[PDB]
Write a protein that binds this ligand. Sequence first.
Ligand SMILES: Nc1ncnc2c1ncn2[C@H]1C[C@H](O)[C@@H](COP(=O)(O)NP(=O)(O)OP(=O)(O)O)O1
Ligand SMILES: [Mg+2]
Ligand SMILES: [Mg+2]
Length: 430
Amino acid sequence: GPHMATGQDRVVALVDMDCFFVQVEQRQNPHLRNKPCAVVQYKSWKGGGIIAVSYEARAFGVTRSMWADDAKKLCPDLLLAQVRESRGKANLTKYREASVEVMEIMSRFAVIERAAIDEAYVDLTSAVQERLQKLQGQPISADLLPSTYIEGLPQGPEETVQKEGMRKQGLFQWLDSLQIDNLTSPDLQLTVGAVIVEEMRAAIERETGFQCSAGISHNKVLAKLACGLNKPNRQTLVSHGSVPQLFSQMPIRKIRSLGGKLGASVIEILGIEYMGELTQFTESQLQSHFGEKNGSWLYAMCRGIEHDPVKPRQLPKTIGCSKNFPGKTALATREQVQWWLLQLAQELEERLTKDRNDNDRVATQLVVSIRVQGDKRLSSLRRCCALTRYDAHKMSHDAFTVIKNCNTSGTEWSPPLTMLFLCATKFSAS
DNA sequence: ATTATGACGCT
DNA sequence: AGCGTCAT
Ligand SMILES: Nc1ncnc2c1ncn2[C@H]1C[C@H](O)[C@@H](COP(=O)(O)NP(=O)(O)OP(=O)(O)O)O1
Ligand SMILES: [Mg+2]
Ligand SMILES: [Mg+2]
């Protein structure tokens, strides 16, 4: 009753750039715009690996982690842009710089947490407060929300047959039910959050050309879930009240962090399918199956409640370079291993020097990760050393020193290496 | 031969 | 410190 928290204390958004690498290439090459298009890295093996897909191409069944030669089977007129290759490896600088463009625009509106190169959470609570003070009493026009969907609406009682008519009918029902006079209203606060996110997305598109989708809700998990409900180039508001119906048919694997082994164990141990079915277990039961942390998180989350804060962090925490050496390309000699460590270290030094100049910080730890042929784990081995100088030869030599005992016997390297990974971590101000 | 990255938890 | 998990 009057003491049960409802998780309605914040307004949180998740902004996702639509098929981001594709949009970057389409801005650069207008011939790719409004066409079935994909971004591919490498070329020789099966036409290269597709890593990003325009929505026009997705309509043909093209997906990420598909060989370009196969995608061309589904979509013969598919257009391709290739990731830049530098020092024998993919070089993602263009997309990192485009991401900075977008994140810097977002940070004018509110505090952002950079979740991925194409994804940021937005803590809007303060901004909504301020905007509500700017409009105390003024109702919110549907015109301020021209790309917003209200999840769960319309509901109940002929233009209902087109998606935009559905969208506007749901929005109308929502706005007609609002109570503009109450400044503490969670639904009103979400609505103003959505107004601000429309403004943010307009500014991103005006100033970069890039479109995005967004979710607006009371916490990061719901905002992330909401963002995916209406894509591309749209945004979705998930209210607290929408959660019981939304979760009642929502596969557990769709909630962030439950798409892997933990979600699978939840399904198998509890014998359920949908997020809402979790409400019928006590907090102690969930803790007994999944641990104290996971159980408390599940108990609250299936009720729409989550407390993970939007961390104020615009910049990545790590700067890493890695390359897989699959199949017959696996590294089998000492010279090979050392040459590729050098290539990785040279890209790393370039990026680290640029980072130190841009962001007034220096990395202090170098993490060296490798995978050995036959091992299915992402990393077979991780070892750290001190990162004391932004010097590619020193960094590559140090990484070799740290990994070289993994070699059984040689000039020869066995077992062959299928992955090398250098990561600069543990930044401090400079 | 479903990349090249990121973020983060457990012990 | 080193390994495991989750994500596109
Ligand atoms: N596994 C991977 N390999 C390469 N690039 C990747 C990647 N995962 C993400 N990216 C980068 C490169 C891609 O630009 C993007 C793909 O990740 P989403 O954000 O999950 N999906 P998208 O942006 O394509 O569209 P939308 O979310 O609107 O549906 O992020
Ligand atoms: Mg995206
Ligand atoms: Mg994304």
